[model samples]
Target: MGSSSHHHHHHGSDWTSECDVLVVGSGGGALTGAYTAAAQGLTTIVLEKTDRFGGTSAYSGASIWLPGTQVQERAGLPDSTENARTYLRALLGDAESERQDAYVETAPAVVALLEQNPNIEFEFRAFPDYYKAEGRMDTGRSINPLDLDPADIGDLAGKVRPELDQDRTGQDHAPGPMIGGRALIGRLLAAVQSTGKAELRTESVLTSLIVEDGRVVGAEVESGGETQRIKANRGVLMAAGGIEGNAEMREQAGTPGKAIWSMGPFGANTGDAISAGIAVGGATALLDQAWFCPGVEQPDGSAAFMVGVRGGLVVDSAGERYLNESLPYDQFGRAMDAHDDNGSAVPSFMIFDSREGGGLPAICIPNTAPAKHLEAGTWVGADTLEELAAKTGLPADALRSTVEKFNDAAKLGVDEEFHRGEDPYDAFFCPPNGGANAALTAIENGPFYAARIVLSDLGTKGGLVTDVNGRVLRADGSAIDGLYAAGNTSASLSGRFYPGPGVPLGTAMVFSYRAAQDMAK
Candidate 1:
């Protein structure tokens, strides 16, 4: 393991292989690096610990927040490097300038290179910026991958992870509905395979990194019940999801939520790469932060990401309304973290009425069995407000008064308390022509419903700290040669604030692309 020789044989070693780049994880960032490296004429190998590719990315909305890309320019959306820099400056307040500059500079190039591949295409779409500050594009700046026909990828299609909601309902195999992040992964997977220089291996778990002369040169991986040493001639890229799937890691990091409530795939993303990086003298930061979203605890005890509530009010355990329900999911989630002396806000209730058009306010998997939810006490319903209060352990008078005041405000299209419909982002998912204020529609009709809501997240956002070139840094701010990280495995370049939709994926793709380019040089 200490040798610099290109080839070595150990009889006890089950298998040994080598490549120019060894990527640990099969998410968007990892595949992007693999694809770019292979296209640059390097032999790249991608290793996924899970049985399937596309970690938490497959379960996402698949929006990429790349500013000033060809997608936005071709779509006639107003975007430029200066505008993006201004927006980021306002949001980040001059933190981590080096990585921020790199993100803005490399984003357009990343998109251009990916689009150069015939199999990859992107479309600029309408999604509001999360904030109303300077340089914010009210019409949105996110790009979505075009839906890919599964037939185009052949057998590889089945290997891609299915959407969580679809998987829960046993409808994962339904054809023609692979949209959002699935499409992104599918197209990228196809592009990487088409390069004829990259290999993807599933069920390969990275155990540790092999170091030689103070440089990372390879990794120890367990696959098919055997441990093998795989060397990287150029460098090793760690884009393995995050620490969200590991309960112990979450506790160690003091992350806010439980692993049971996270949207990350189960049994995957236990911070193997991040831990490996740390073991090799890498520095970490912002470990407690995550891409937060309000989650509804389903009847099966699994959590579902809840967004775009049109006709609902999220009330604490006391049946009193709190923050605006229409805020960006991350902001809304942070509001849920606020607690009173009683410590009762952790599991809030999303209260809505029949005018909400039945069913849950947002899309959630296993959401069909309303009666089952009620039976399981995860959801409570009643034709009358008082009865609903009794069933849900909420105060009847407080619940009724809260609804009355909200309805009065709805008629005037004003949220007197929290300003629900004030921002363009708040109405992004509201029903068109539905009410005076789309996000503030009256919750007057009955029978009303209340579902238990909790703090959940896409995944943890913090890990190893890296520079503009995606080189992992040590405690003293020196780069660790031959070690790079991106995606959720790296400390987010945006620091703590989420500037817009797709920022996570956008930054991940850009930095990983940069990492591959730097490795090539």
Candidate 2:
């Protein structure tokens, strides 16, 4: 080891900090790996590019789909390991069978490990977190972190990124227990910190991977206004998420989303880790895909992740219905892509009445002021349907007929056109008062609204390729020694299909844990 005081980049013994294992990025996966390593009595260090922990995982609903675990068993939740595997098999169809086996088989162990920690606990929150499959939709399989009081976690709670709305507007946690993503992130931080074997540092950006010959030995990073090469005796885990925030990267990779519309912490996941892996000859796949969603354009030109539309109809340019308005967000997003040939469906319009008091009849994150939206033209409103059509540049006749046909379907208690209300997911967020079908409501009220809709994603599902053991691999299917990846940093095993609610986080956690155990051995 060497030492240096001058400003020039220093290598080897000049290690500003060294650890048995180094984790890049402070998301759920990164923290999970750090906890696993520290709990195993290994010296661990976590680096976060931003001042806050919990990448987009903090912005999530935090339903971890690690099924057949003690958490589900304690609740007597009806489940079998084979049932979970069957679901994955039914959807994935033998694709990446090794990973499918690893994820489902190791889930119980992962959940048990996290639960063994005093600070971490999960309960069966009755969340709508599945696809529209027979006998499986609308319940079970998701264990959420119990809401934790900020005071319980001490100062670390303040460091977890606030939810999307608060973080965007520069606000802190309100007077309440940290729920959803906050609770999950807070609990993991508490567990990891309690181990006393790990160091969590924020604003430490990973600049490049340090390789001795062909193996990853450490990483060179920019920390505290100085460049330092940190040695990793065992390995480095890259859980630093996707290229969603880098518009140029998205364009180059042919990923179908805009950075401004992506539902990640703004400017946070710009493909630093993915780019670094590729530079070291790692393989990449699924670069053109994302965990897609329908985003409601916000007043300031960003987007709100729009899900669970209880009512309303979507129309493309020329004002015609395309797909079901309530297809589980990812499927709906894909449907939009499938219909958009000439770029007409990208900025589609969701037409709704004032049934919800001039608000969007769906869940939009940050739920901005309606008056502000109208003023900003992100939302267009009119008293008559014809005027609204004119304002949105849609053919008046087509718009009126689309609404008329939709109203008939609503009155009939059936979505004969798009079959919107038939699925368990379609009506999950609808108000009960809507007659016939809760998911269907007549758009007959005055003050019609057309909110702009675009394709959004929870995060890009594409990144570095990894094996069953979570080792980053070269193009010829050989593992990169001392380099591992999980979370959005790894090319998702599920390929284009998002299997369930916490597949993103659960896969990330399980693989990160697996990667750490591999390093520990």
Candidate 3:
């Protein structure tokens, strides 16, 4: 509701303030840190650089890949941190390293803190882990966000930021309507406001960290047409996201040539937090991998993506399917990188038809903010298969033949060629409701649509490295005191693979809370 763009323009000399803790970013990690620090009775200020808050988490499908989380245990689900760590080790190998060790050790403690708060309520989903085939350690138990009623929080609604609310009911959880991460964060924000300890400064951009004596002192923020220097007496938490949305930073990160479908909004997900932390001697890790998802280029040059349990077979310009579409998205993305040799596709497209639409709902262009091509009927349509292929610009006959072959295989209840319904990720979303075939639905009917899809990402995982306690570390693995980082701004704890839902949020909650607890101790 508040605009701080003018303040950012005059940031250097005019901005100055102070708090016990300053959190940069407003997504799951930053908000969790702000909430945890505030709950611990610390003077906390959360500066959101965007016109609003919620960060990527709000725009996301709201699955927290939190293996062995407290929410799961409360639901009588079986899990263990040791097994979770084992899965991480298998996926990341030695890349799990010291940072992974810190996250695994303190995850449960962070879960406990978030659970104790009346402002938060987490419900574990009955969904399987992302890759159930990986091994016994790869059990699927993730926490789904419960309904966060805005009416319950009274006046705090004013502080809650706006975001896309596709999962308003969160029926993806079970039984009734499902609430998503944005909904949960929306509720938490109200609760944070209710506590009278957390301050959400909208439109305020953090320019740089206030470093003094080799420690993070605070940050220089621009707000209300003036630059304000806010001193963090305790520490600064960097959750402002990564370089995925910032092409310049992505190029610097050696990922420039790849098609960057940063479906996540770029209001403030630049590497500012990481840059600021590194300025104060904070080390970084996992500066290569990212949080990838399938995206389609919009006519206006932006990108759009589908949220929830859905994915499609990616193809090269030649119209041949590339990569195992059913593979877990993280692995699938790597496959894309391999396909392109780390180069990018200009206005790429992921082609699909309505016959495959029964499983996950097709990308619904909201009535209010309709996508350009999607609404113009240029991006999606239905008629004869040949005409449909023509609209999508794929080889019409070859596309028709591919559909026929896929349909024949679907009728046999087997994906003979590219196994689409075989993988856990595919089976979960591809199966028809109350149907025997999981992930083998035939693309037989007409009125098909091929909404453009892109190879977008949620955020970048490569950033300042830290120990599990969230203490900033140098390349030598030594902790930097009076400084901490979490969320996407910090290097990911999981290496090459995403374990399950809630992992990113869980890591943020665990380490951000742990940072406070350890700092207090």
Per lDDT, the best of the predicted structures is 2
Scored against the true structure, residue 504 in model 3 reaches a CA lDDT of 76
lDDT of 1 by residue, 1-521 (tens): 23332333333442388899999998889999999999989999999998889988887779898889888889988689889888898888868987888988888999998999988999998888887789999988899999888888888889888888676565564667578878888888999999999999999999888876779888888898988889899999999978998989989888887788888888798888899999888999999999888888877777788876766888888888889888888988878876533557778998888764667777664354677778888888899989999998999999989989988988898998998887887777876674778777777788899999888889899899999989999999999899999999999987768889899898889888999998999
- Tell how far residue 210 is off in model 2, in angstroms: 0.5
For model 1, give the 10-residue run with minimal summed lDDT: 1-10
RMSD score of candidate 2 (Å)? 2.7
Candidates' C-alpha lDDT = 0.85, 0.87, 0.64
Error of 3 at 334 (Å): 2.7
The runs of at least 3 residues in candidate 2 whose Cα sits more than 4 Å from the true structure, single-residue gaps closed, are 1-13, 132-137, 431-434
Model 3 regions more than 4 Å off: 1-16, 132-139, 165-178, 194-196, 256-260, 307-314, 341-349, 354-393, 432-436, 447-451
In model 1, what lDDT does residue 288 have?
92
Residue 357's lDDT within candidate 1 is: 61
In model 3, which range of ten residues has the least summed lDDT?
Answer: 165-174
lDDT per residue for candidate 3 within 1-521, as digits (tens), equals 11132444455343356778888878877777787778868888988886667767766556665656677678776677777676666666786566666676666666676667776777776655666533333336667667766666665444444443332222222233325755667755765565677788888888776655566666778788887778788887777778776777777776522334675564457677787777667777777678765554555555555433343334554455655556665655666666664333333445555544322243431111333566765366657767766777777777677667766765676666766666555666554654345554455565665655455666777898877677888888887666788887788877667776667777776777777666556
lDDT at residue 442 of model 3 (Cα atoms): 57
Name the best candidate (by TM-score). 2
Q: State the weakest 10-residue window (summed lDDT) of model 2.
A: 1-10
Candidate 2 per-residue C-alpha lDDT over 323-431 given as tens digits, one digit per residue, 9 for 90 to 100: 9998888889999999997888998999999988888888889779889989999889999999999888889999999999999988988888788877666756775
